[PDB]
Amino acid sequence: EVLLLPIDHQPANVTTPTLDFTNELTNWRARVCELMKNLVDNQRYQPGWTQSLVSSMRGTLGKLKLIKSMTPMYLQQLAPVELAVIAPMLPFPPFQVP
Amino acid sequence: TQSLVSSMRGTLGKLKLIKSMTPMYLQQLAPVELAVIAPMLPFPPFQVP
């Protein structure tokens, strides 16, 4: 009666969800964006680029990190429920390894 | 100009690390090919130090 998930599950205590950034997927996205920003700001890389393009890249990275996507929230706290609902009635039961 | 200097530095950095196999080929395989070709040849090799 146990199904495994690559990502962790934190159930939701509300029935009217809305955007928030506290979860592993959003953290991963933000850290990737921050690492790209630090790579751009590297002293061996910034002089190779023009002044305006650095600002454009910084703004694009900031907008990408602050985008409003509910997919991380869904994957955290609604996808496991649907998977556990579908799994029992299925022509091939889940076959999993740790 | 500042933008031209930045472009020159960017081009130099882009061309410093261009991924071409020719130097490794010259180091590692070209001598083998030359040594294979050398024995049978219409004019044998003639070299000075």
Side-chain angles (χ1 to χ4, degrees):
Chain A
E1 87 178 61
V2 160
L3 183 63
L4 283 72
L5 301 168
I7 58 173
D8 70 323
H9 180 37
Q10 313 294 20
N13 314 297
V14 298
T15 49
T16 44
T18 187
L19 171 65
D20 56 346
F21 316 96
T22 45
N23 57 7
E24 293 82 3
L25 277 298
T26 303
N27 278 337
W28 181 247
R29 181 182 63 193
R31 299 298 180 271
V32 171
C33 295
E34 271 305 359
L35 171 147
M36 295 204 251
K37 198 176 303 193
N38 288 121
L39 183 140
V40 165
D41 277 353
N42 197 5
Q43 83 75 20
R44 296 177 63 195
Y45 197 87
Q46 186 173 5
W49 274 0
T50 65
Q51 183 71 264
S52 304
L53 189 153
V54 167
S55 297
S56 303
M57 187 66 204
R58 277 169 177 161
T60 301
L61 279 174
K63 293 182 183 292
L64 214 47
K65 180 264 289 181
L66 292 175
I67 204 163
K68 303 190 179 316
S69 164
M70 277 198 233
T71 313
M73 194 203 316
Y74 170 78
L75 288 178
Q76 183 189 253
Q77 64 195 10
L78 278 181
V81 168
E82 306 170 2
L83 283 174
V85 159
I86 297 169
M89 41 206 68
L90 183 63
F92 187 59
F95 175 80
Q96 271 183 339
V97 292
Chain B
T1 52
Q2 193 53 252
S3 76
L4 179 70
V5 178
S6 66
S7 294
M8 191 55 158
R9 271 183 283 210
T11 295
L12 286 181
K14 202 103 176 183
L15 180 137
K16 171 193 170 33
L17 61 83
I18 177 180
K19 41 194 51 173
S20 76
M21 312 295 267
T22 304
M24 181 185 38
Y25 168 84
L26 277 175
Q27 183 191 6
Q28 293 174 30
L29 294 174
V32 173
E33 307 181 2
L34 284 171
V36 164
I37 297 169
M40 71 275 288
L41 212 59
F43 184 61
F46 175 81
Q47 285 179 348
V48 298

Coordinates of all heavy atoms in Angstrom, one line a residue, chain A residues 44 47-51, chain B residues 3 5-7 9-10:
Chain A
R44 N 36.5 37.1 -15.1 CA 37.1 36.6 -16.4 C 36.1 36.6 -17.5 O 36.4 36.2 -18.6 CB 37.6 35.2 -16.1 CG 38.8 35.1 -15.2 CD 39.2 33.7 -15.0 NE 39.7 33.1 -16.2 CZ 39.9 31.8 -16.4 NH1 39.7 30.9 -15.4 NH2 40.4 31.3 -17.5
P47 N 34.2 41.3 -18.8 CA 34.8 42.2 -19.8 C 34.6 41.7 -21.3 O 34.7 42.5 -22.2 CB 36.3 42.2 -19.5 CG 36.5 41.0 -18.6 CD 35.2 40.9 -17.8
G48 N 34.3 40.4 -21.4 CA 34.1 39.9 -22.8 C 32.8 40.4 -23.4 O 32.6 40.3 -24.6
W49 N 31.8 40.8 -22.5 CA 30.5 41.2 -23.0 C 30.4 42.8 -22.9 O 31.0 43.4 -22.1 CB 29.4 40.6 -22.1 CG 29.0 39.2 -22.6 CD1 29.5 38.6 -23.7 CD2 28.0 38.4 -22.0 NE1 28.9 37.3 -23.8 CE2 28.0 37.2 -22.8 CE3 27.2 38.5 -20.9 CZ2 27.1 36.1 -22.5 CZ3 26.3 37.4 -20.6 CH2 26.3 36.3 -21.4
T50 N 29.5 43.3 -23.7 CA 29.2 44.7 -23.7 C 28.4 45.1 -22.5 O 27.9 44.3 -21.7 CB 28.5 45.2 -25.0 OG1 27.2 44.6 -25.0 CG2 29.3 44.8 -26.2
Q51 N 28.3 46.4 -22.2 CA 27.6 46.9 -21.0 C 26.2 46.6 -21.0 O 25.6 46.1 -20.1 CB 27.9 48.4 -20.9 CG 27.3 49.0 -19.6 CD 28.1 48.5 -18.4 OE1 27.7 47.6 -17.7 NE2 29.2 49.2 -18.1
Chain B
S3 N 32.9 50.0 -26.1 CA 32.2 48.8 -26.7 C 33.1 48.1 -27.6 O 33.1 46.9 -27.7 CB 31.0 49.3 -27.4 OG 31.3 49.9 -28.6
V5 N 36.4 47.9 -27.4 CA 37.4 47.2 -26.6 C 36.7 45.9 -26.0 O 37.3 44.8 -26.0 CB 38.0 48.1 -25.5 CG1 38.9 47.3 -24.6 CG2 38.7 49.2 -26.1
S6 N 35.5 46.0 -25.5 CA 34.8 44.9 -25.0 C 34.6 43.8 -26.1 O 34.7 42.6 -25.8 CB 33.4 45.3 -24.4 OG 32.6 45.8 -25.4
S7 N 34.2 44.2 -27.3 CA 34.1 43.3 -28.4 C 35.4 42.6 -28.8 O 35.4 41.4 -29.1 CB 33.5 44.0 -29.6 OG 32.2 44.4 -29.4
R9 N 37.9 42.0 -26.7 CA 38.2 41.1 -25.6 C 37.3 39.9 -25.7 O 37.8 38.7 -25.5 CB 38.0 41.7 -24.2 CG 39.3 42.4 -23.7 CD 39.1 43.0 -22.3 NE 38.3 44.2 -22.3 CZ 38.5 45.2 -21.5 NH1 39.3 45.1 -20.5 NH2 37.7 46.3 -21.6
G10 N 36.0 40.1 -26.1 CA 35.1 38.9 -26.3 C 35.6 38.0 -27.4 O 35.5 36.8 -27.3

